[PDB]
């Protein structure tokens, strides 16, 4: 517990750039994107603002679009007179990937009809379209295979306080290890994070703060509509602050909080306000109505594992279930707790062999054991209850591929 | 209940198949057969022959037998097992966990086929496991996979009875002959014989 997490002062101008997003939809071959840019103000509507959107790929400006404030007609009432939203069009825009995280910059500008600025705020754009197709998760049109690792925010040292230079640090030894995505589990990770993975490229699945793993059944408070508010924000509130990142392919409800009627209500909302990704929880079985990915943690490759109500089933014979279709991305695989990972290659085996079968999150990164000291103030790993803390679960905090101090296993 | 039709020597298969000129022809040998037999409960799935490829005539009589009776799935495995001429994904010989990417029809492991993107017939092999000779290999691994996965819904083995036939010697004596031992020729030896019993029953 505690302020674990930057504090810090921002000073904005009384009429301003209250929010703003940016879409990137592209042709049948991807050699021609339009980027729509939403802008939205606060303050007094004077006639003379104005806003500009310019799109940068370098020092060499791409395009650019002005316009005064007020939108087109949404309703018997009218529209929006304090927004505005600028189409850009970009001929054989230079697409964003893990493998090219080619990227962009968007300025946004907030002015007077005379040239004045009042404030601008900006981001990287990356252009890059994400959808599921005949069963299949496609990036630019073509198919994923998704070389992933859940990664907790943890130091041996600071606890959850995250630095850059260990950002980079995990980073640098993920894409060096051959990953292409990382799932944040589970909840919405420090700023900084996305922005690394935007200009380092990796697929992210970005993770509402919630799981109620410890309630009985799980989806107590998951099913019960006095909780839907509280639920709603930290799904929303990922949303309206992650939505312009292109490292962000895949939105996620939680974690292991059952499935409840809250999840179907959130996971409309997701779709809704945002179709460019998409939506998925592994929660009261990994294939409910709530996820557009069969996302099963632990689920094997041949052998089934037919628990009551939410069995897991071989990933292989998953995908043929009777009127299934979607794609089967494990949210979760391949437990690396000490002497593991025993088996893993029957898992790209099957992944390579099956179209629909598009990888998956390896569990997980790095162990979250701390740092202790003896009498002569030596450092030693401790885990679970070297710390008076009771009950605990021991050792069962450290899985991760490297030691918490970054050391590969 | 299966077509009287397969033209397997011809090369691409599908050249009478997908010829117009031929249509009438294979038409009589579908039409006629439903027109015989659809009051027999005991036939359950109507088969528009076998190995003639996939041809444009094979699309018109799927339909028509979809027409006139609504009862009966129809299946067919010519020009790849999954073609829009089969109800049921039937291939021939296809492994359990084994791909053999053939080009233009492949044979895709059975458990693969079921989830290709957009698949969703069931999969029920209309010839597996070779019976031929010191064979039956393997045998167990298709069931454990039949039962495990729901849309795999078995098979029908090839085959039955071995096509030998007797002869005698200059002791008056019988035996088993196969192919060539006619004096035909050309022939294909032994490859007749690829039962689960001999012509006379016994087991193998
Ligand atoms: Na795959
Ligand atoms: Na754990
Ligand atoms: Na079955
Ligand atoms: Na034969």
């Not at 009498?375 to 209850?385: D, F, H, I, L, T």
Request: proline share 6%; aromatic share 10%; charged share 20%.
């Amino acid at each position: 517990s505690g302020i674990f997490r930057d504090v810090s002062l921002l000073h904005k101008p009384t009429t301003q750039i209250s929010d703003f997003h940016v879409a990137t939809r592209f042709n049948d071959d991807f050699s021609r994107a339009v980027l729509e840019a939403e802008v939205q103000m606060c303050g007094e509507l004077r006639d003379y603002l104005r806003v500009t959107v310019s799109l940068w790929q370098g020092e060499t400006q791409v395009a650019s679009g002005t316009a005064p404030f007020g939108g087109e007609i949404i309703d018997e009432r009218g529209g929006y007179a304090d927004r505005v939203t600028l189409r850009l069009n970009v001929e054989n825009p230079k697409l964003w990937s893990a493998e090219i995280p080619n990227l962009y910059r968007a300025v946004v500008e907030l002015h007077t009809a005379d040239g004045t600025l009042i404030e601008a705020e900006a981001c990287d754009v990356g252009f890059r379209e994400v959808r599921i197709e005949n069963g299949l998760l496609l990036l630019n049109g073509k198919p994923l295979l998704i070389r992933g690792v859940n990664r907790h925010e943890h130091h041996p040292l600071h606890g959850q306080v995250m630095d850059e230079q260990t950002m980079v640090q995990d980073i640098l030894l993920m894409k060096q290890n051959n990953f292409n995505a990382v799932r944040c589990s589970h909840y919405p990770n420090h700023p900084l994070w996305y922005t690394l993975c935007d200009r380092y490229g990796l697929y992210v699945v970005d993770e509402a703060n919630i799981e109620t793993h410890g309630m009985v059944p799980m989806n107590r408070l998951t099913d019960d509509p006095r909780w839907l508010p509280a639920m709603s924000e930290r799904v929303t509130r990922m949303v309206q602050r992650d939505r312009n990142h292109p490292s962000v392919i895949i939105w996620s409800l939680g974690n292991e909080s059952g499935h409840g009627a809250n999840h179907d209500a959130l996971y409309r909302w997701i779709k809704s306000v945002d179709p460019s990704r998409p939506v998925q929880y592994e929660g009261g079985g990994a294939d409910t109505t709530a996820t557009d990915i069969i996302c099963p943690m632990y689920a094997r490759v041949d052998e089934d594992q037919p628990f009551p109500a939410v069995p897991k089933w071989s990933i292989k014979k998953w995908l043929s279930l009777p009127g299934e279709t979607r794609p089967l991305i494990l949210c979760e695989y391949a437990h690396a707790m000490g002497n593991s990972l025993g088996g893993f290659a029957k898992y790209w085996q099957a992944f390579r062999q099956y179209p629909r079968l598009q990888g998956g999150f390896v569990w997980d990164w790095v162990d979250q054991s701390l740092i202790k000291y003896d009498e002569n103030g030596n450092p030693w790993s401790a885990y679970g209850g070297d710390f008076g803390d009771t009950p605990n679960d021991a050792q069962f905090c450290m899985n991760g591929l490297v030691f918490a101090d970054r050391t590969p296993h």
